[PDB]
DNA sequence: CAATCGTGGGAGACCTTTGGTCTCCCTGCAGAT
DNA sequence: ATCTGCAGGGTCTGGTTTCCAGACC
DNA sequence: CACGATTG
């Protein structure tokens, strides 16, 4: 039936995929934050829980959010911002009345044959073209990425293959 | 007439506080979650959403919340777990329906003169029953300084002042 | 259970299968179109 | 606006605002 | 503050 792909970092998106077949992918929602004297980019609380209320899913559909999990290397800001990041969506989700289920992006990757690509946003647009080519217009740019990513989450879920 | 306070770590609290003078605190629900092998502590989101959605306190009360600021030699670990607690907080609080207004430690400290404090979590305690003297049995412990620090919080939005 | 202490730390899925191996982002900022 | 590269980083409030100083989980 | 441990 409904599945819901969410990609939460800052780039991300929200895929909804429908019983029909068709699709919707919605940037993720962003605001401009003074934060120690520069801007940064935060994701809009306000907006993206208007977004999910504003959905056709029914009640208990399920929304598979990709596992926040970021490198030792990264820095400590970069920590922050996915904990942020993951925390709101999940509870934004669980608020709107969706089943959150987190899964890991090698899960899905490995999935649609992904996994050690050494141009792996550019492969993830092209899958996520083939899976949904009503969105081909919507993934051209390399910045479509979280796009691709939360088509093929919610892809994932519904149990689409690539021909 | 009705102001919320927000102390949103794992060992944080909620506080609600209504025209007629009377207050209430909870302490943040938790669960034991594995992460590489190991158990952590993590806030209960469901808990949460259905501990707000109880509250007397009307649509657009305004919940105070500690802003999120780690120090930088605080740990990665550290960093994820303060943005996802801050990150669930505000968009469970804008979920429910409540304006959530961020407050700087140094701001409420400062306030009731709580700066620079040699036991500041006794203080804060101490500070709270005080303002909050039918909560006195509910701050005897030191672990129930973050029952403290969200009634603190609250007492600062609605502008109580310490006799 | 409650307190105290010291330092600041990956996590996940599946295989080789009860440990081992391999894999995965992101933020923030500058610079060049 | 789009992208690319690279290293991994505090942030906050109120002073004497034009940055400093001192403070915080 | 988290995290992982020991002490009371
Ligand atoms: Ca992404
Ligand atoms: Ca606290």
């Given at each position: 039936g409904w599945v819901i792909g969410v990609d939460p970092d800052i780039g991300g998106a929200i895929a909804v995929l429908s019983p029909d077949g068709s699709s919707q992918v919605f940037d993720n929602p962003f605001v401009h934050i003074v934060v120690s004297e520069v801007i940064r980019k935060r994701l809009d609380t306000k907006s993206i829980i208007q977004?999910?209320?504003?959905?056709?899913?029914?009640?208990?559909?399920?929304?598979?959010?990709e596992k926040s999990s970021p490198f030792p290397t990264d820095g400590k800001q970069g920590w922050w911002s996915t904990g942020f990041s993951y925390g709101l969506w999940i509870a934004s989700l669980v608020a709107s009345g969706f089943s959150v289920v987190p899964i890991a992006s090698q899960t899905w990757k490995a999935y649609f044959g992904l996994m050690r690509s050494e141009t792996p946003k550019d492969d993830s647009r092209q899958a996520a073209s083939i899976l949904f080519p009503d969105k081909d217009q919507s993934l051209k740019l390399k910045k479509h990425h979280g796009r691709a990513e939360a088509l093929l989450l919610a892809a994932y879920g519904k149990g689409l293959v690539l021909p």
């Amino acid at each position: 039936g409904w599945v819901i792909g969410v990609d939460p970092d800052i780039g991300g998106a929200i895929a909804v995929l429908s019983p029909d077949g068709s699709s919707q992918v919605f940037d993720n929602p962003f605001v401009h934050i003074v934060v120690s004297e520069v801007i940064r980019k935060r994701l809009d609380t306000k907006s993206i829980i208007q977004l999910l209320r504003g959905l056709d899913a029914p009640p208990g559909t399920t929304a598979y959010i990709e596992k926040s999990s970021p490198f030792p290397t990264d820095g400590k800001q970069g920590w922050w911002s996915t904990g942020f990041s993951y925390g709101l969506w999940i509870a934004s989700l669980v608020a709107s009345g969706f089943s959150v289920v987190p899964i890991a992006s090698q899960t899905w990757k490995a999935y649609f044959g992904l996994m050690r690509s050494e141009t792996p946003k550019d492969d993830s647009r092209q899958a996520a073209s083939i899976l949904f080519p009503d969105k081909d217009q919507s993934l051209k740019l390399k910045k479509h990425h979280g796009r691709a990513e939360a088509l093929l989450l919610a892809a994932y879920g519904k149990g689409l293959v690539l021909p």
